Design a protein around this ligand. Structure first.
Ligand SMILES: Nc1ncnc2c1ncn2[C@@H]1O[C@H](COP(=O)(O)OP(=O)(O)O)[C@@H](O)[C@H]1O
Ligand SMILES: [Mg+2]
Ligand SMILES: [Mg+2]
Ligand SMILES: [Mg+2]
Ligand SMILES: [Mg+2]
Ligand SMILES: [Mg+2]
Ligand SMILES: [Mg+2]
Lengths: 247, 247, 247, 247, 258, 247
């Protein structure tokens, strides 16, 4: 029910469908709020692994101190914790796909811990003495410029080229004008339902404006703008005037 | 109890009643001491959740070390934490409202931690392997210009669009002259009673001064000036002369 | 046992007596050694709260790391913190008065933490989920000019309006000529007693020069100068010569 | 075993004996190696506390992170302060004398922490709820020009007036010619004893040179020069030639 | 065979120079001395060797010799690893721990690359160097230890003092005895004996047939103003032996090295 | 299985064969991605220690805070953190060979710490009082010309003399014409195998681009472009079109 229109955005859809079967690293890039999360969620859904669990993690929100332990896991006892052994996030995602959003904001110290893990697909639980092997597809996302961080010495060069084997860029909305209106309508359906309103669609006078506003917040800002409009709506349609106070 | 007399403020008064039913995040701006907290607490009382918990947080007062742990919560066995597991502030506010005050003073590193939590209402407990989802309405406030801070790279662009579903600016007092006297009189009533004094109201010449002093501290300054005035009053009324030493 | 002889100090002394019933924060300013500390104790003794605890604190002296914990207090578990629950200085002063000297030396980042505590008198213990409310009258003092610093952006504007309910400035010593001699005798009386000397009073020639001194160190400097002078005293009276080497 | 043959140092010696009874802080200044430590160590021996504790401290050797803790002391709790409670240096010096060497090397921010402690002799232990009071004589030393530092804003004026009750200036060695030879013989005595040598005294020509030698390092340099000579000595006396080589 | 290993006779060492011969004698005089020593010179001149030697000829030769790169100590634990620390006062460890100073008690302490220290860091050592006294971190008992200090730097230290880049008061604590090591280019006599010594060592390890140098080669070595000094030589000789074929080395083999 | 064709690449292999017995540090120079690690990795395989461990490390990438700890290792405690004892990379490489990558990108300050370690192979564990001694062969790499860099004061002169015994450069690619083609095919074999593809070899049209030289990223770019090309391959042979699409 989602929207893929325009020559630019439709082209990406083909790329994704072909790599659905692949076991190899993925690097997703673009501004935040362009729909990168949907794509990340989509690759898993379209893959040979569609029925398995999808584990969402906000990286960098993990403290550096428990990062390795909280991720890879630990056994019973073994450096003053609990009594019983506890699974790590990788083993829970074993056979599945793990999505790390905003990887580019990760600390230099933490990257090194997962670094050796990337190539071997093997690791040691903290305090565990038996090497474990798991099968996990890695997905990554960031709203920032990764190319820059490497040049600034803020990002390891070797990690970029390992994850950046395949790189998929999402362009902003201002470079996809054809996609604007169909999306706006999709949100109307959702918001009209939520707040139980009588709204149907937008007047043409309103529609012309969206194209001239170069949308710095992309999809994420739009979704918010519509939600505002539906709430203050009176009739079933929204005029340019109701947007004017919004802009 | 609460005072709104003004063109500017009455417009806002209407705005709140419509989102009383709304489930989405709110971002309040204005100088500090214009009543941002009153607005935040009021939305809750006027909403359908008015009977549920309301959690007030300074968020600048939170220590960096426990920031992650004290917020989301943890399961027993996170690097020798306690014995027992403890819920987080998000879980405590479930069904209720969570207010993050003076958010604009937060460091970029910390802002990012909150990213996945706001929109999805989902997160992971520390040491927990089970994804938790809770229902909490989020309000935020700051006394600085956040739109400018983003442009200066001092505040995350992606976080702004998550909280900024609704944006409400509070105008200063000098742009609300009609609010001055009602506010001034209301504060006097409580203080005269509290400190058991004989004071009732203001002389005409005194009232004229309040209108001419362009109030840089806004409403918060007013309350104090009356409190200063009430304590030193002799007769039942306050003249312009008694204010002269205060201004 | 305290000395107030002067037009300047007697006027202020009256103000203190009038606010004895008031429950609100006070801001003391002045050069170092002018008695800013004395007033803070005096307000307490003359107020209705005079019989309850008076807590003296160098706020600048609080290390940043435990700054939050030592102030608000904490529950048992805090990253292997203690065993037992412990109250903070705000809770310790409940029903009493809390005196923060050198408020002006705090970093902008740290000041932000104190905001909700000052006005609401409310906070959350560390690891505690129940909002606590305390009753504390706040007294503050600083050797800096706050009105200037705010304009220089070196001090939070919003915090000033929270603490600044009552503002007391106080003049240096050179602008109080009447206090010099009465004070000098008290210290001489004190030190002659302490150090068992034969000294009684001052020669006429000595006294005239002393009054014409700029006194950058104010009363504290006097106390030191008398202590220095008494030790080297020979006769029962002190001449201009023993003081002359200091000026 | 200490040497004072100079007119200036003899006057100071008298000055010291008169102030032996005082309980108040002393500030010693001068070039390094002029004997600032012997005087400080001596005053204790001549005071009423000569049998009481003498605490020697390099305030510069205290690391920034525990500066607060190592000084005031701490209770089991607080930091993750492990298990045992520990006294602070101030509690250690109660009834005794506290010697702070190289006070002049403190960072302006750090100076402020000890401020209330110096004058009041009062503080709170870390995690402690009972105010502790001690009676401590404070001694301080610096190799820097302190009068200058205040004027440049590099040293707080407020601390100076707390510490600066008694100020003792030690002149360099080049301004005490009378002290040179008596000192030299004493140093000759010790090293001749330690290294079991045959040396007795100086040639007439050599002694003259020492007097014309602008000692920049003062006594500390002399001691070293003597130590070199005793080691390399052959006969019972040292000629100008043995010194000519140095340097 | 590899790098003796039972070291009967010997690692030995070469001193044939007038300057170095004079310095060797000076050392013999301080064998009884308990006082700090300051060694200066270009890099690779044997400053470490002298330091190890002063220890060997002293009365403390049988007691501990603590070798330390001070520059390598982290700023954060610098105070702690040095003076030592008690059970608390950090979030450090559990148990109390001795410092390197307390470890060298009765012995000799060698501080290498002292000249690279930051002014903030130098000030901390003051009471410890001259008085030999300090307080352990979190400790309330004043500790007193007996330690002879040796120091080294590859820079000009008097210069640093005059430039305000090195604390003056500290200089007079360490600088009781000061030893300036001249470079090799000012010791011409040491050149040939050294090269021969290195050649023999490497010939054994890497089993080659080389014995000595041609007359033409020796001339070049003398005209090479050795900016890396002996350390450069040791490397240069080691380089030649591996690539050596016959028993002698000509000037041609050196040209690619210089 | 490594590819050496060009005369430059073939001659160097012979040089190594002679020094296989040598135990001394090595200095490798050339552009990034020229095979410095492979040359280095081969040397180990050819050495007397070839059967012992080989430790690869990027030095410039280590964070300053843990730089010392991860390198020398540490005993339990002696740090704020670190429950567990840790071997260092030096001790981990004991009896083996240690490869330091991108030394030329290392901070000047960090270089000074390594001095005694390189030549003497001795150090003290962090918090350990027992001296550690190891037998380790040194390998070094840089993307810059070091002899020049020292003269610019960007690299310590004394450290160079430790690593710079033998200096061997490598041409990037452009002076090796013969190595280009054999390499590309070698990867096709692995990548066709790894991802189970139908690919066999390259068409003549593909090769024409390969002969169009300008590889600014040298060999490192090649491996990635081929890895990229194989995934996007359609037929059993690859035309210029999938390669043309990148650069
Ligand atoms: N047969 C080969 N195929 C691909 N790459 C090779 C081959 N032989 C050597 N290399 C190159 O060896 C290099 C090893 O990395 P290196 O260039 O030493 O690191 P840096 O780029 O940091 O100098 C790789 O970049 C790789 O391209
Ligand atoms: Mg995202
Ligand atoms: Mg607020
Ligand atoms: Mg004060
Ligand atoms: Mg001193
Ligand atoms: Mg050296
Ligand atoms: Mg490399």
């Amino acid at each position: 029910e989602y929207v893929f229109e325009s020559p630019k955005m439709k082209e990406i859809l083909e790329k994704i469908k072909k790599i659905s079967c692949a076991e190899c690293p993925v690097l997703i890039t673009g501004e935040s709020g362009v729909g990168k999360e949907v794509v990340a969620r989509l690759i898993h859904k379209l893959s040979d692994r569609s029925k398995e669990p999808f584990v969402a993690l906000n990286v960098a929100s993990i403290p550096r101190d428990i990062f390795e332990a909280e991720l890879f896991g630990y056994e019973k006892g073994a450096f003053t914790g609990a009594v019983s052994s506890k699974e790590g996030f990788f083993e829970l995602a074993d056979g599945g796909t793990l999505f790390l959003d905003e990887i580019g904001e990760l600390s230099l110290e933490a990257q090194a811990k997962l670094l050796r893990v990337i190539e071997s697909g093997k690791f040691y639980r903290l305090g565990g003495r038996k090497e474990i092997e798991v099968n996990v597809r890695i997905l990554a996302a960031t709203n920032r410029n990764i190319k820059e961080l490497v040049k600034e010495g803020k990002f390891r060069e070797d990690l970029y080229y390992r994850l950046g084997v395949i790189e998929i860029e999402i362009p902003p909305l201002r470079e996809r004008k054809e996609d604007i209106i169909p999306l706006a309508n999709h949100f109307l359906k959702k918001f009209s339902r939520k707040y139980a309103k009588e709204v149907e669609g937008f007047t043409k006078s309103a529609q012309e404006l969206l194209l001239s506003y170069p949308w710095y917040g992309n999809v994420r800002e739009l979704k918010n703008v519509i939600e505002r409009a539906v709430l203050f709506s009176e009739g079933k349609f929204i005029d340019r005037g109701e947007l004017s106070c919004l802009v």
